[PDB]
Paper text:
As an alternative, GG-SpaA protein was fragmented by limited proteolysis as had been done previously for other backbone pilins. This produced a 15 kDa-sized fragment that can be crystallized in two different forms. Whereas the tetragonal crystals had diffracted to 2.0 Å and 1.6 Å resolution at home and synchrotron sources, respectively, the orthorhombic crystals showed diffraction to 2.0 Å resolution at both sources. In parallel, we solved the crystal structure of the tetragonal form with an advanced molecular replacement program using search models from distant homologs. As a pruned search template, the C-terminal domain of the S. agalactiae GBS52 pilin4 yielded an interpretable electron-density map for model building, though it offered less than 20% sequence identity. Refined models for the tetragonal and orthorhombic crystals (residues 176–298) gave Rwork/Rfree values of 13.9%/15.8% and 21.6%/24.9%, respectively. The structure of a 15 kDa fragment of GG-SpaA that had been generated by limited proteolysis is identical to that of the C-domain of full-length GG-SpaA (see preceding section for details). However, the electron density for the residues belonging to the extended C-terminal tail was not observed, with proteolytic removal as the likely reason.
As the first reported host of “non-pathogenic-derived” pili, Lactobacillus rhamnosus GG is a gut-adapted commensal lactic acid bacterium (LAB) and one of many clinically investigated probiotic strains for human use in the prevention and treatment of certain gastric ailments. As with other Gram-positive bacteria, sortase-dependent piliation in L. rhamnosus GG (called SpaCBA) is assembled from the ~30 kDa SpaA (backbone), ~20 kDa SpaB (basal), and ~90 kDa SpaC (tip-located) pilins. Two immunoglobulin (Ig)-like subdomains comprise GG-SpaA, each having the conserved residues of a canonical E-box motif and internal isopeptide bonds formed between either lysine and asparagine or lysine and aspartate residues. Our findings show that the GG-SpaA structure has certain features in common with other pathogen-derived pilin-proteins, such as the Ig-like CnaB-type folds and the presence of internal isopeptide bonds6940.
Residue numbers in the entry: 176 to 298
């Protein structure tokens, strides 16, 4: 059994869904998520939810500068599956902020198969 997490990026005031908000995910060790293929090679992802399972990708933990950026799609959605447990705490860190917004505060989460909103304050 594996777990997933979804987020929806929204304007804090209007709740408009925001596209193109980019996030890195950190763990308690202060390392950041980098997806690889089964053979350790880098992969290209687009916006939205990433089906790690269907792609047989692997989760690895690297310096922030080397991490995968996960990006909200046109509906504001992003996330991934392939997490090993629902008990570990991670942090979603906004690194690429849409125009007209201030970054959301970092968001602690567990891979608990839920969806939650991440709010960007309009500038």
């Amino acid at each position: 059994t594996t777990y997933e997490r979804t987020f929806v990026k929204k304007d804090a005031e209007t709740k408009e869904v925001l596209e193109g908000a980019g996030f890195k995910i950190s763990n308690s060790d202060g390392k950041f998520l980098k997806l690889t293929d089964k053979d350790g090679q880098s992969v290209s992802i687009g916006e939205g939810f990433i089906d790690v399972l269907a792609n047989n990708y692997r989760l690895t933990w690297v310096a922030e500068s080397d991490a995968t950026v996960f990006t909200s799609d046109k509906s504001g959605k992003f996330g991934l599956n392939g997490f090993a447990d629902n008990t570990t705490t991670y942090t979603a860190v906004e690194t690429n902020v849409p125009d007209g917004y201030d970054a959301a505060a970092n968001t602690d989460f567990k891979a608990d198969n839920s969806s939650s909103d991440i709010l960007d304050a309009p500038s």
